[PDB]
Design a binder for this molecule. Sequence first.
Ligand code: MG
Ligand code: MG
Ligand code: MG
Ligand code: MG
Lengths: 380, 379
Amino acid sequence: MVSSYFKGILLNLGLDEERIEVLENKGGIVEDEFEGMRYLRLKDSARSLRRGTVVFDEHNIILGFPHIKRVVQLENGIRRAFKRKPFYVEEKVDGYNVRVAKIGEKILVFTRGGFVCPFTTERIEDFITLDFFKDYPNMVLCGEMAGPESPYLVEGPPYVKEDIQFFLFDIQEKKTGRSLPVEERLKLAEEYGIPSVEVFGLYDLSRIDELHALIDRLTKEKREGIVMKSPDMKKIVKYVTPYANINDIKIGARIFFDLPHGYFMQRIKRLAFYLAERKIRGEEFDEYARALGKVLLEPFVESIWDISSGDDEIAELFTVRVKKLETAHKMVTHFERLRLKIHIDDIEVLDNGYWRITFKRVYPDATKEMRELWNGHAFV
Amino acid sequence: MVSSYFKGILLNLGLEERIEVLENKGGIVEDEFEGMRYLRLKDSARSLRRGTVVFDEHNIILGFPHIKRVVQLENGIRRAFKRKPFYVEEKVDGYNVRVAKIGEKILVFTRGGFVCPFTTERIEDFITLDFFKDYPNMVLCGEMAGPESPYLVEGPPYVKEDIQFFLFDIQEKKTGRSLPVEERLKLAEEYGIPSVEVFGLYDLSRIDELHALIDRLTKEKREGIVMKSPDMKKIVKYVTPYANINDIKIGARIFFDLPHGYFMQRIKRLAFYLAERKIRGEEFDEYARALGKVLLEPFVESIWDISSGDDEIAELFTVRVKKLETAHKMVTHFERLRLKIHIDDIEVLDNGYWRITFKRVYPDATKEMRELWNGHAFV
Ligand SMILES: [Mg+2]
Ligand SMILES: [Mg+2]
Ligand SMILES: [Mg+2]
Ligand SMILES: [Mg+2]
């Protein structure tokens, strides 16, 4: 299933031969390839090797990016995680996660599951300079790709007016995955001109009222929230705005079916805890209640009306810019391997010579369930 | 674990290897009420649904079948009934009971096959027993519904106190076969058995009057309808937007540890009603405000509750009983069902009945809600 070459490295990393075989049998480790380079991808977690870890050889091991725990009550979440000790507060940028690393003679960009993104890898030199990897070839840039022309999202931060951008939020060591302290990472980002998430400053529990004011401002500005980090990067907690929760519901409600478990309920819970913590009442409360009802029902009702007349499927349209037409071809192939039903809907050349590719992703299982229900299917 | 007497009947009913798996896994269990032992089917086995109870070779009470719902009324009718006629009955919001003569006793069973000590002791208050003198092999299936219920905190608006029985089926022992609608209604009248309201005989061509009926039931805070072919072979339910919104209001006080999809299924049902009826503008906005309010207001109120104090999320509800012993039997029964319920208040009514106020607490929902309020971090 997977070569003993890769199993050999997993052993040198301390993994047990018996565990390696179980992972191989269950598909928890799989082989993949990008432009001729073979690598092992961890679909499941293995000891200190997180999901999304990729292995090319004994040195080129890129650990998966760790999950970040959330709090839904900000003040008490800070007291529990940080006590009264200081922490950095960074913008949580709404995009997709990437890890950028020098592998052999190539710069590869890995998405969260450990796939090489052909779009982001081809265009990485538009978003960052590569001087960093000349000096720090054993280091991994971790960041968010975010913007209005994204291959993976249909929303983004409001200050990105076109195309897509990189926002550094961590620098990690190969093989160990160890994060540099915040201050060192920011010094490297400035030294190399690497675009960074916005750092709002150093805060602590005693400054909770300013943090609430920050959340309210990010809400009005249609931004997602914050990530709180101890200076040594050992404690990390996220917290999202009510806008993030309401807009996610709006986007998701067009599809409604076949979404991750709890997608809607978790966000309703996050809204209720925000409303409780901030003691919002009266007319202000009613505005949130009306907004929640609207984003649950209006996009869903609109899709029911759509699927009730015709053979059209529920779809999302999105665009990206590419330098070479071949890249668009590589994306369609990549989208299929990821089991997504995506095709090219439109192509245009821009005034700067980039191709603007409009993709259409359809949701056939969600469409089928919605249409069967509309056509009167009876269920227990 | 389970007697060879009961396993023998299960075999005579068509179930031998499956019987042993059921015994080992606890899918069939033995129970007892006032000295009568019976087998209860905790899981379904072939044509024997969950809630089937077995006392002997003859006294077999089949579990009540699930009823499929439609969320799009006009197309659901076209699919289920085509253009053939069907009866339309009120769906009464209560709990399901099966009433049967077992030996010399009249026992009342809830959906899972437990004898309800409350409904069994008081059954003569809700129905007459003449029916079982003439039809001892028949089972009355009905809804117990009202403002003083042991199992619900809502009920139909036209029941002003206590609780009432509403007949909706008459089934044969052992076979579970339902009598045709017209025959069940004639029996209900002959024996004075209270019935669910029958709105009449409808068909697809009368879909606009059915919509008008739904709108009236919503305005009157009633749950919906059950549609039945005259031979009882095709049965479909459809609930009002009020039922969906009020269920959410009730559930949102607790939010956690509820059945999977409890909220999402009702939002789905709300959306299909709004689509089918082409509701728009201000009328649409009223439904969106109502949905937002019932999701958030009870939930926020409970967060405020658990944030100031050490109290647990609780529901208060009352019932009337004739004997205090009955209240004692209910507390014991509630514990056996793994519910944290205790007696909060007791009073004697002007008619000599005891009104018992129970308090059910929700320790698992309370703990999760409180941990979240106290800043617990989670993936
Ligand atoms: Mg994100
Ligand atoms: Mg979002
Ligand atoms: Mg019911
Ligand atoms: Mg109800």
